[PDB]
Structure formats: structure tokens, C-alpha cells
């Protein structure tokens, strides 16, 4: 797995590969690892598929109820907090690395990492999964402050493509999501659409 999210002015871009492995058998080659938690809040999932699906479903429930009570769009920070509370409390029973990214009217585009252990940190961009080792140098060299949305999509597509080449546990298609005030735009990069080097 490789997952990644980038903040820009007015929103976020999320990305993931689509490979699910049992050992070195690919059980699912078109996995969807970007899960919507609310209208403009997503999470990228890495680790145990059982764990991240269960935690995501639970947070969706919690944030949905919370949002109805308050009668307002939820904060991205609240979504991240709900993930952190579960991932921290059950750190001995979970293998889950989450990125929470989205837009709210209060703080705009936000990216939060909740790695294994259940710490929570806001970042300009975040990477996770087994495949992320291979692209630390790339993202550190390529990232620029003040990137547009189109540039963030390209930056994410490139980074994931590089990770996907090297990491046996990553591969398939690239799923991308852009989140802004105006809503969510999803796309898939497959075959020739995937950047080549």
C-alpha cells in the first residue's frame, strides 16, 4: 500500500494504489483505499483491511450523528480526533495507519496523519503504507509551498507511480480525489495514464 494526501489553497488531494495482497498473492487489484467519512472528509487506509474498514465505519457513524446534533458540517480536525481516539485506545489490537484529509468552512483544506500507535499530527502533505519508504526522498525534493490543485494531482500521481514501481505490496491503478468547498472529484489513473519514468 501507498497512500498520500496534499493540502493546497482551498482544499486537499488524496491518492492511493489499489493492491491488496495475501503474502505475495494479489487478492484484489482494484481496491478502493480512499473511504468517504462525510461530505468533504475522506480517509486513506493502510495496514489491516479488517481494522481500517471497521474503524472507518465506526467513525462515519460517530461523525454523522455528531453532525446532525450540531446541525453544521463537521470539522476535519474532529474527524481526525475521532480516528485518533480509537486508534490510540486500541493500539494493541489494531494495525492501522490512517490519513484524514478534507475541507471545512472554518479551517479550509487539512491533512492529518494518524500512524500506528494513534498519535495525531497535521501536515502540509502526508504519506503512508509500506510503499511510502521509497518516496520520502522524492516528496522532500519535489514538494513546493503554494502548489495549485492541478500540481497537487500531478505531484500525487508521480509519487504514487514511483512507489508502485518499487514496492511489491503496491500497484494496480491510482485512485485520486480532490476535495474543495464545491465538492469531491474522483478519478482513476490506469495503464498509460500512470506516469512512467
Amino acid at each position: 500500500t501507498t497512500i498520500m494526501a496534499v493540502q493546497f489553497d482551498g482544499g486537499v488531494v488524496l491518492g492511493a494504489d489499489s493492491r491488496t495482497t495475501t503474502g505475495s498473492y494479489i487478492a484484489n487489484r482494484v481496491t478502493d483505499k480512499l473511504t468517504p467519512i462525510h461530505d468533504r472528509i475522506f480517509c486513506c487506509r493502510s495496514g489491516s483491511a479488517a481494522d481500517t474498514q471497521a474503524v472507518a465505519d465506526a467513525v462515519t457513524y460517530q461523525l454523522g450523528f455528531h453532525s446532525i446534533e450540531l446541525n453544521e458540517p463537521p470539522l476535519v480536525h474532529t474527524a481526525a480526533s475521532l480516528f485518533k481516539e480509537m486508534c490510540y485506545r486500541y493500539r494493541e489490537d489494531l494495525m492501522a495507519g490512517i490519513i484524514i484529509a478534507g475541507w471545512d468552512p472554518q479551517e479550509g483544506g487539512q491533512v492529518y496523519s494518524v500512524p500506528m500507535g494513534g498519535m495525531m499530527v497535521r501536515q502540509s502533505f502526508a504519506i503512508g503504507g509500506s510503499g511510502s519508504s521509497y518516496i520520502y526522498g522524492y516528496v522532500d525534493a519535489t514538494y513546493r509551498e503554494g502548489m495549485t490543485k492541478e500540481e497537487c494531482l500531478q505531484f500525487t500521481a508521480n509519487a504514487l507511480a514511483l512507489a508502485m514501481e518499487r514496492d511489491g505490496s503496491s500497484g494496480g491503478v491510482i485512485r485520486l480525489a480532490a476535495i474543495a468547498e464545491s465538492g469531491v472529484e474522483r478519478q482513476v489513473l490506469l495503464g498509460d495514464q500512470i506516469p512512467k519514468f
Partner: protein
């Protein structure tokens, strides 16, 4: 080898009318890392015999060295005698069994393809000295993913032409690329006929990812 380091995945083989074809990707994996993406895992042994190897790449290079020298030695004599594919396969069986029995295996599974006396040869040798012949072979994940497709075609049509066997091998390599996490979309195909051993590559398969819009 107690512990394999850089490794290669599946090797495939199928007999056809007038020869044999084998295939292997060009990847050496270091655990899950796709580390060396342009290495050959196929060897021309002599004019009638070729060899492909799964497993530890260093151990393969050693066998290439040993077996390469063996064929040079024989050619020096110029006596009109030459190692048949069956003889190479026999030698390999003995060598692997010998190393296994010393508790110091060569960490490889191998496919020997050959053509001699108007007869196709296809043989398997594993690191424990298990060896046999079959009309089609597939090592590693190929055993689970490619061999069922190979045996399916050979059931309805035992005798394949060269082009039919080539199409079938390309189809299997596509499946392995889809389903084996240690595979790579860059492979070689080696063919042995009356004309000798040819090695083609690098080759690629075209992929289809339409099912990505079917969730």
C-alpha cells in the same frame, strides 16, 4: 544458501511441434522490493538446451558459471558428442540433490527446455532434487496461476504450433503480472528448435484495468 536474498519468481515452459518455449520476467526482488529490474533469468546452455531459474539469483549465476564451463570443456574435445537436454537435466538433478544432502541447498527451481533428435524436452528440477518431465511446467506462483491454464489448453489440443504456444505463454505472463506481487511487466521468451536457441526481450504485456470502474 540458508537464506535467499535477491530472488526471481515464476518460470513457464510448454512443448510445441518442433520445439519448446520458456518465459521469465527480468526482475530480481529483494524481499518485497523490486530491486534489479533488468536481469536475465534464462540461459542458453548449448545449441539444443536452455534453462530458466526461479529463486536465489546468486545461486543461479553460480550454476550458469559451472554449467557454462562444462559445455566449454566438452566443445574443446570436438569429438562429435554433445550433452543432450536430458543429460543436462540429469546432471542438474544430481547437483541439486547433492547440495540438499549436504544441508547446503542451491535455492532454485529450474525449467530445462530442449530439442534433440526431433524430440521436445521439458524438465523440472527443484532445490531438493525433485525432478520430472511434463508437456508444460510453471514454477512458483506460476504453479497455481499459469499451470491450470496451460494444462487446460493441452487437454483440448495436445499438439500446439509455435505461434499457438507463444500466444498461450503471453496470456499466462499477463495473468502472473496481475496476480503475483513479485512479478514485473518486462519478460524474456526463449525458444529452442532445430535451428537452435533464440532469446527474445525485453517483452511487455498489454493490460486491462476496466474492472476498476466496477466497484
Amino acid at each position: 544458501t540458508q537464506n535467499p536474498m535477491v530472488t526471481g519468481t515464476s518460470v513457464l515452459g510448454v512443448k510445441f511441434e518442433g520445439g519448446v518455449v520458456i518465459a521469465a520476467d527480468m526482475l530480481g526482488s529483494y524481499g518485497s522490493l523490486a530491486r534489479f529490474r533488468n536481469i536475465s533469468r534464462i540461459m542458453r546452455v548449448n545449441n539444443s538446451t536452455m534453462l530458466g531459474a526461479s529463486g536465489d539469483y546468486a545461486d543461479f549465476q553460480y550454476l550458469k558459471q559451472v554449467l557454462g564451463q562444462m559445455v566449454i570443456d566438452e566443445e574443446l574435445l570436438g569429438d562429435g558428442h554433445s550433452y543432450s537436454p536430458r543429460a543436462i537435466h540429469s546432471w542438474l538433478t544430481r547437483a541439486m540433490y547433492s547440495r540438499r544432502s549436504k544441508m547446503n541447498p542451491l535455492w532454485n527451481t529450474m525449467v530445462i527446455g530442449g530439442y534433440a533428435d526431433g524430440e521436445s524436452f521439458l524438465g523440472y528440477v527443484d532445490m531438493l532434487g525433485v525432478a520430472y518431465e511434463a508437456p508444460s511446467l510453471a514454477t512458483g506462483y506460476g504453479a497455481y496461476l499459469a499451470q491450470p491454464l496451460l494444462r487446460e489448453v493441452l487437454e483440448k489440443q495436445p499438439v500446439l504450433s509455435q505461434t499457438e504456444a507463444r500466444d498461450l505463454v503471453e496470456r499466462c505472463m499477463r495473468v502472473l503480472y496481475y496476480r503475483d506481487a513479485r512479478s514485473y511487466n518486462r519478460f524474456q521468451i526463449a525458444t529452442v528448435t532445430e535451428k537452435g536457441v533464440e532469446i527474445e526481450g525485453p517483452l511487455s504485456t498489454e493490460t486491462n484495468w476496466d474492472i476498476a470502474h466496477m466497484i
